[PDB]
């Protein structure tokens, strides 16, 4: 006899939009999210296993779309730089990293146009004599971030809609692929802070016992391997100078901000990372990479490539954009602080979106940043047909795809739907 049951504890993999929740407008305007439950504890599913794949996981794709959308929602109404895209006459003030440039400005919300000056970085300048244009004062649109809007990562929790559940893999050293034998479930994920960086991942979760490395295909050199440390390596970064800001009227209701003055002398931005922790970190990574590649000597050979956003380590700090010289870190080899000059840019090709860019306002000097350094994004350098000559594997820093930064955390989660109805035979009326 067919007996009907309701409340059957079964589920299937399913895709659905996840609900945003918070711990409690900037970019991460989480006041629009629903605060999570107190004591949001999980349920351990004993004798339940599940099959995970971090490179298929759609939670990463949803997260990707939210971070882009939020960034555009907050930048949309802000002052345009575009009306200022004129050719300017500039002087040289390590040389002339920050330059005092000037033009007969045609905005200034007036008919009586005037000469005005501003301080810009050479990093954002295309020479055009001593005249120039900015790098995105070509075939792209530049908007400046509102001075009232911070980025503020904030940990964000994603929750299943009712009728759905998130299964979490708690199996130690799990690589994000295949069956997980330690599975528990939650309505909501833990809060994950957005991280905006390349090459090195910032504060986030750590590996349980030892550094672990994950890849969709380790032998495919077109893929990036994600290295998760079991300990962090703290780094401090600064901009050891003072500055002032100046406004330009662009529109009757909008002001554009540039550096007004350099206060005190000019000094290079830089980072200072513990050398001992860094050296131990690469030895640990190389050890695990050797297990993955059996037994080859492993070397770190600095970055390479074109665009500095990929080649230099990048990160956000407050509202500032830093690019750092990691050639001082990705060095040496194993077969068993450190100062990084940095650069500050004002025009950001965020998301590598073609045709658009953001301009960052001045912070008036005194930049103080810090981070944990929790993992690496690496690619292999090469190989080709060879006449049985030699060996040694080498790696380089990688980045530019924000989905890997998210993937490095989302690898522990899967979304399923709950299907409470079913039948089974018994006996009945």
């Amino acid at each position, epitope marked *: 006899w067919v007996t009907v049951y309701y409340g059957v504890p079964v589920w299937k993999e399913a895709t659905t939009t996840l609900f945003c929740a918070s711990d409690a407008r900037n970019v991460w305007a989480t006041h629009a999210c629903v605060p999570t439950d107190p004591n949001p504890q999980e349920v351990v599913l004993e004798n339940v296993t599940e099959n995970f794949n971090m*490179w298929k996981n759609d939670m990463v794709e949803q997260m990707h779309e939210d971070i882009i959308s939020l960034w555009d929602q907050s930048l949309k109404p802000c002052v345009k730089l575009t009306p200022l895209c004129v050719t300017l006459n500039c002087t040289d003030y390590e040389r002339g990293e920050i330059k005092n440039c000037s033009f007969n400005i045609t905005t200034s919300i007036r008919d009586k146009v005037q000469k005005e000056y501003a301080l810009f970085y050479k990093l954002d300048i295309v020479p055009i004599n001593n005249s120039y244009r900015l790098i995105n004062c070509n075939t792209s649109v530049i908007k400046q971030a509102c001075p009232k809007v911070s980025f503020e990562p904030i940990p964000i929790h994603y929750c299943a809609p009712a009728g759905f559940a998130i299964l979490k893999c708690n199996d130690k050293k799990f690589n994000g692929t295949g069956p997980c034998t330690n599975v528990s479930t939650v309505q909501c994920t833990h809060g994950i802070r957005p991280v905006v960086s390349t090459q090195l991942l910032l504060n986030g979760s750590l590996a349980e016992k030892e550094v672990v490395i994950r890849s969709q295909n380790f032998t495919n050199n077109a*893929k990036v391997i994600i290295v998760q440390l079991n300990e962090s390596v703290v780094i401090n970064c600064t901009r050891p100078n003072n500055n002032t800001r100046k406004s330009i009227h662009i529109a009757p209701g909008r002001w554009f901000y540039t550096t007004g003055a350099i206060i005190g002398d000019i000094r290079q931005a830089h980072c200072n990372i513990s050398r001992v922790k860094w050296n131990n970190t690469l030895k640990q990574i190389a050890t695990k990479l050797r297990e993955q590649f059996k037994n080859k000597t492993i070397a770190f050979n600095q970055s390479s490539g074109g665009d500095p956003e990929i080649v230099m380590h990048s990160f956000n700090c407050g509202g500032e954009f830093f690019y750092c010289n990691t050639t001082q870190l990705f060095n040496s080899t194993w077969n068993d602080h450190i100062t990084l000059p940095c650069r500050i840019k004002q025009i950001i090709n965020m998301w590598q979106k073609v045709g658009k860019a953001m301009y960052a306002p001045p912070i008036r000097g005194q930049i103080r940043c810090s981070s944990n350094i929790t993992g690496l994004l690496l*690619t292999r350098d090469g190989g080709s047909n060879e006449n049985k000559t030699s060996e040694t594997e080498t790696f380089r820093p990688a980045g*530019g*795809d924000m989905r890997d930064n998210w993937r490095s955390e989302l690898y522990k989660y899967k979304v399923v739907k709950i299907e409470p109805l079913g039948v089974a035979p018994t006996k009945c009326k």
Partner: antibody
Amino acid sequence: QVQLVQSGSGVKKPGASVRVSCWTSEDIFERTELIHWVRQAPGQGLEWIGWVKTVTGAVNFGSPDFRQRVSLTRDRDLFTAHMDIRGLTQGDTATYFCARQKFYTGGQGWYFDLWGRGTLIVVSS
Amino acid sequence: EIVLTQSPGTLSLSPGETASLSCTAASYGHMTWYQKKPGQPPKLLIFATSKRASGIPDRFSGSQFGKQYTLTITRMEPEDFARYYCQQLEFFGQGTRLEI
């Protein structure tokens, strides 16, 4: 068989540099994950040179000699890519080709779905 | 280490009969096949997953079940008497040629 457009053929003297371009249609370019470059010297099999990633400009090389002498770049506004070879020797005479890969997942391997016609680069006295 | 090798290299054929080519490689994995005529870039025949590439009128196919992959060439048609190559990611075979 969609063709890609390459810069032309020519002869260079030793030590010279050559600009090998590869242009494609806007949709062909956008649907490509990787741009691959290969070399086929007369009498030789096909040698992989390297690749440049279509979004980031990130690179990977076959031989370390290419890693030192060959710059692989991309331009998303122009829908082009380039292979800039410096330090040419007579041993580099070959037909050079650009090709593109539309494949994106693990387990698929590498592909040449789209091809240019190749350019003949000759290096001599 | 020679990661990928290809053979027979030189094949003596009789059109109407079916030919076979093979490649073996270190670390296994999927591998593709391409063929070219002089003056042209090679065309993809076999996807790394052994699937037939578009444009081929059901002439080429094969399988692995080891470090080796073997494909056959239907009826040795002279139209396909091209130089063939295997590819395993960054490695290529030295190639083979079909000759009557």
